């Protein structure tokens with residue numbers, strides 16, 4: 001019965017343990033430190049009367065989109081701090097948002113268990129196949145946007161048809177965040193089961209399902225190279241090629257809120273509910289410096305494709321876009 | 324050389340009067356507490372106290388210490404008007420925050436409805452405008468005519484009729500409004516406390532309200548009482564008792580007010 | 594060319610004007626989350642506060658038959674098979690179900706239904722009698738603004754309950770708990786509701802939110818109290834040590850039922866006053882139409898109890 | 907029941923060397939480190 005599954009789990013654990021050839025810290029030792037780099041709020045995207053729970057960059061590296069706690073969705077020009085469009089959401093609560101690389105449409109999730117894609121140039125279509133609140137979205141293509149739901153079942157959509165092309169299921173706990181790789185041939189998802197499984201684009205099979213973290217996995221982001229990714233304060237990093245824990249990431253006691261790497265990957269912009277995002281070295285595994293401009297807990301972060309600067313969307317209604 | 328020590332004490336008082344409002348104003352400007360009607364009103368009162376301490380206090384201190392007034396009357400009347408305006412602004416803001424709190428308690432379903440950033444700006448502007456200090460400069464309404472004419476002296480010998488109405492419109496109506504509003508607040512808090520006490524098993528607010536009421540009371544009542552007395556009764560009041568008591572007491576009020584005025588994080592931020 | 598800058602400035606001005614117009618209503622509206630226990634009558638309070646009827650009756654009767662099939666799992670034979678086989682739905686079955694409800698097995702299942710789950714026996718008799726008056730009554734957002742204040746009720750309805758952690762600015766969280774469902778599966782339903790209330794009150798995110806716990810179905814609780822089939826002592830041992838509270842305001846009226854109701858309220862209030870958030874209990878039945886008025890008085894007693902705590906007396 | 911299937915699927919993986927993966931990641935961070943903004947051309 002379950003003894004066979006337990007034996008398989010033990011064999012997987014043993015293979016992973018023996019796979020450990022050397023410690024990452026050994027390589028980190030020779031790595032020269034990044035240095036204390038203090039970000040500055042060269043702009044202040046403010047003027048949004050809610051606890052902004054969404055913060056997604058645009059592929060053009062010019063515009064960002066945020067979702068209200070009351071239902072107002074506003075697109076922002078980071079250069080002019082002028083809100084280009086403000087389309088309110090039919091559902092009062094929005095739990096996530098995403099900007100399509102084509103830019104023709106902007107994705108806006110919600111807690112109404114229905115995902116609606118808005119047409120920048122009204123709602124183009126509504127997706128409601130999944131069950132429970134839309135955990136996260138990231139428009140992979142102009143017709144394929146990946147959703148995420150509290151039903152422990154992430155799904156792929158065809159925007160034109162408005163039906164779930166495929167299905168992904170198997171996670172014990174509710175999935176709370178998903179991220180897509182630049183290669184677009186794979187993605188990852190962090191669930192409440194303290195586990196992460198890198199699903200396939202079409203097959204729907206977990207390439208390397210890891211469960212290193214202790215508490216629920218709030219968020220996960222891809223490394224720029226696409227060969228690795230990363231409620232407890234610790235935010236571990238895993239190398240998909242080795243399926244192990246690349247490095248374990250001490251006085252911090254708050255909860256991890258969002259994760260985002262840098263263009264060179266050295267900086268791992270991590271924001272907490274302690275109101276001060278802590279930026280840690282990805283290779284040297286050291287805490288270099290922090291930033292803090294807002295008051296309420298941080299909701300989401302992000303980095304532009306050009307990598308010029310970063311955004312910090314908190315619940316304090318102020319999206320201080322640090323530079 | 325006791326005058327030297329008295330002047331040192333006065334200098335310390337002036338420095339405290341400046342700092343006790345400058346710190347609050349700087350914290351309000353640097354932090355995100357702004358746009359709140361209560362925070363905006365507190366900042367306005369602190370600005371009034373800062374202006375009063377910066378302008379009126381040192382000139383009056385120099386007048387007390389050195390008998391001669393080394394400057395001219397054209398700016399001396401400006402000093403008198405500025406002092407009148409600052410005292411009026413402090414009292415008016417102390418009453419305005421009371422009115423805001425009273426409406427917040429008595430109608431929470433309209434507390435956020437009535438208050439607004441534009442409404443707060445209008446209220447603050449009206450309070451500052453409420454003329455009573457510009458009239459003495461223009462109308463010259465501010466028997467020892469030599470001091471009003473000579474250059475050495477500056478003694479406040481004004482109309483008995485002007486003094487009564489000025490003191491009334493500056494303090495009496497604010498006093499009645501503050502007392503009534505705060506008594507209503509105390510009654511509402513007592514009723515809420517009893518309603519909570521309806522829970523079986525398992526009054527500091529009285530002291531909390533009493534501190535902020537008594538500060539204004541014991542800092543302002545005697546000076547205006549003496550003002551009315553000297554307007555009515557001429558030979559009863561000595562000059563030195565009037566001066567010491569009036570100036571210093573009302574002025575100390577601004578510092579006491581900053582202290583009476585969340586802010587700890589802003590204060591600790593610097 | 595500065596035309597682009599001028600156009601963007603005009604658009605930003607229009608958007609800011611619209612946002613300023615909306616902010617008045619956005620702040621004016623008061624929001625409440627009606628987090629209620631499953632099958633605790635949360636609909637009944639919502640129905641009172643505010644084609645499918647026949648469909649509901651068929652749904653309930655099938656659920657009643659589903660309970661009857663589950664009644665077989667616990668502890669006219671062909672008629673029972675007819676409904677159970679036709680239980681799934683995308684005349685003869687109707688009559689077979691009516692007969693099965695008339696069968697003594699239905700009476701036995703209704704009598705021993707603590708372990709069983711039901712929506713409903715009054716409607717089941719009514720369905721057998723069979724819409725009728727009050728038969729249907731016996732994120733679903735709600736916008737029922739009082740003539741004085743704008744009140745909007747939000748329904749969530751999730752073991753992890755991160756949906757709770759999502760909300761942090763509701764004026765109050767309605768926690769409808771059915772007092773009667775205490776004999777009704779390792780732990781009793783009342784104890785599970787108490788655990789849920791403890792979790793909500795002791796929530797890190799929901800630090801500054803009060804709960805208005807309306808003890809629903811108090812009439813059913815009193816009725817079950819009138820019979821001594823299952824004393825509260827057997828379910829809750831501490832009941833025997835408990836005695837009547839010093840303060841009591843009985844309606845018109847049963848000392849035993851009064852003791853039971855006050856015990857339940859005190860049990861809730863202990864966890865409520867453990868640790869701010871102020872719990873406002875009530876004793877309500879479905880017929881009581883003053884629910885909206887009580888909620889309004891509680892809400893007016895929230896902000897007043899909040900501003901005084903907001904760095905004041 | 908499907909957990910056995912998932913474990914069997916995860917059984918067959920061509921695991922890469924941890925040391926080699928670490929070195930590759932270090933080199934990848936070194937190569938991209940030049941153009942890492944995190945003032946003349948910076949939009950700010």
Ligand SMILES: CN[C@@H]1CCc2c(ccc(O)c2O)[C@H]1O
Pocket residue numbers: 406407410411479489490493569570
């Ligand atoms: C010399 N000090 C002045 C004298 C008269 C005066 C004061 C304050 C408020 C008034 O309405 C006054 O008429 C005092 O600050």
